[PDB]
Amino acid sequence: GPHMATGQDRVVALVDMDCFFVQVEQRQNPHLRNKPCAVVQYKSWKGGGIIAVSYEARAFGVTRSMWADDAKKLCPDLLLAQVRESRGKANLTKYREASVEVMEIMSRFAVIERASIDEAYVDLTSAVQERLQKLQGQPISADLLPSTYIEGLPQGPTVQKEGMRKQGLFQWLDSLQIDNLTSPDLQLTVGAVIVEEMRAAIERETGFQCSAGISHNKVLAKLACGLNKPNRQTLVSHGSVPQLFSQMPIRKIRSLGGKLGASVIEILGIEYMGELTQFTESQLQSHFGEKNGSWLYAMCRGIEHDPVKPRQLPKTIGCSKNFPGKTALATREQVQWWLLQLAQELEERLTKDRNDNDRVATQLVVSIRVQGDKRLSSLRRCCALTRYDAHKMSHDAFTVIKNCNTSGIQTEWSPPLTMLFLCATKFSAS
DNA sequence: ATATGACGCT
DNA sequence: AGCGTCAT
Numbered sequence A: 001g002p003h004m005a006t007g008q009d010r011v012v013a014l015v016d017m018d019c020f021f022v023q024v025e026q027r028q029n030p031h032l033r034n035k036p037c038a039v040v041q042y043k044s045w046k047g048g049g050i051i052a053v054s055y056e057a058r059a060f061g062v063t064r065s066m067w068a069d070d071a072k073k074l075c076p077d078l079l080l081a082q083v084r085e086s087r088g089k090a091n092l093t094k095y096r097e098a099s100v101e102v103m104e105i106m107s108r109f110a111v112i113e114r115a116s117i118d119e120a121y122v123d124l125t126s127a128v129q130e131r132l133q134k135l136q137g138q139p140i141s142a143d144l145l146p147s148t149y150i151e152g153l154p155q156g157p158t159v160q161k162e163g164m165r166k167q168g169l170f171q172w173l174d175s176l177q178i179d180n181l182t183s184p185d186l187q188l189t190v191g192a193v194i195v196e197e198m199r200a201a202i203e204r205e206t207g208f209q210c211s212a213g214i215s216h217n218k219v220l221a222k223l224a225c226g227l228n229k230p231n232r233q234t235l236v237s238h239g240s241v242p243q244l245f246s247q248m249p250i251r252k253i254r255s256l257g258g259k260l261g262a263s264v265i266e267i268l269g270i271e272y273m274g275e276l277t278q279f280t281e282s283q284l285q286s287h288f289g290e291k292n293g294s295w296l297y298a299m300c301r302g303i304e305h306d307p308v309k310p311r312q313l314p315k316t317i318g319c320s321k322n323f324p325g326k327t328a329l330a331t332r333e334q335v336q337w338w339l340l341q342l343a344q345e346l347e348e349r350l351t352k353d354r355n356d357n358d359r360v361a362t363q364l365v366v367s368i369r370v371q372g373d374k375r376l377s378s379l380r381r382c383c384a385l386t387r388y389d390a391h392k393m394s395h396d397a398f399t400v401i402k403n404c405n406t407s408g409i410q411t412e413w414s415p416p417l418t419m420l421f422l423c424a425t426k427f428s429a430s
Numbered sequence B: 001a002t003a004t005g006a007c008g009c010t
Numbered sequence C: 001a002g003c004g005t006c007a008t
């Protein structure tokens, strides 16, 4: 009881842009705003692959990884914006720059960890302490939380969605202990006040809307964030966890969406995250290893200790392209030409990076995929990255993979290459 | 015929 | 180092 830690030590948020690439294209082109809209890359094969979908288009069943031609069957009036294409490949620069807009705003409030192109974790523990002293045990008004849901509420003894939201919020606020600066629920609440402010600033200054989760750790914040998308934020308290997890499929928790999660379900014969509480830590460790077992034992209780890393910038800078089916690269001159296209984009991005961020990459990782192999990568090799020069980088990349060629013929490259990937890594200050 | 980026294992 | 996992 009195010595059992409860993982209520931090206030952590996860901010995620709503249909991000779509919002970027909608800001630029007002004709797309408030429409069923999707963002696709390429266009020839079945109209392009969809990678972002507006909430209006989602209502018709349009999803990520759908071909545009297929999406149009679900949604005849679907509007499309295409990813820029440069040097014969998708060029994501517009979205990366839009991401930086958002991240720089977030960074004004607190330490952020860039988690993807459109989301960041925020460690609000300090900011919350500040704001709490700033306040004089002053009650928190529901007016400070106009887009916040409290997960699990309302409960106990309206038919509108906004109605429910306020009911739950009222119940939450009516029960808060505002004179105890160390109440975790109070700290979460103040955290949510700050995230309202953050989300307001992002929208005012960029035009982009986002959702957020506020809880005591990254996993719960990320889970919370998805509970009430779009344009809303969700507070998941420590106390909400038993009911929330009691029907929560294991695959919904970050890192359990793949094979480990499947084995948890398979080996233990369970479905829901809460069902994990019935196993001892040693049991879980026996099945899934020391780290995973410990992590699971704590997580199913709502406890997780992964820190918000102070890192706003990506650690690697890479470019890749798939060459599916018949388009697989079959000749030496083909492989070289595409390595060059990749290396030229990489040079551009690295030079920009060196100027903006005062660092230089020192290692170049070269990765390929051969026809027949259904892995992400067939093979990875590194070499020194000593100069930001596309021709040198592409020549080096070729050198470290040219032995993979099975062909005896000068011209030919067998087996044909279905993917090329160049990645700059191991940065140093500059 | 579905462009990236972080991290763990050995 | 090079491979595998998980993710957006």
Ligand SMILES: Nc1nc2c(ncn2[C@H]2C[C@H](O)[C@@H](COP(=O)(O)NP(=O)(O)OP(=O)(O)O)O2)c(=O)[nH]1
Pocket: A016, A017, A018, A019, A020, A021, A022, A041, A051, A052, A053, A117, A118, A229, A230, B003, C008
């Ligand atoms: N090239 C490529 N881009 C992708 C992929 N997946 C996502 N992107 C891009 C496109 C996404 O816009 C962006 C953010 O990824 P999310 O946060 O998972 N989804 P979104 O923000 O669209 O909607 P919401 O969060 O409201 O559910 O990352 C992919 O598989 N490939």
Ligand SMILES: [Mg+2]
Pocket: A016, A017, A018, A019, A020, A118
């Ligand atoms: Mg998003």
Ligand SMILES: [Mg+2]
Pocket: A016, A017, A116, A118, A119, C008
């Ligand atoms: Mg995201």
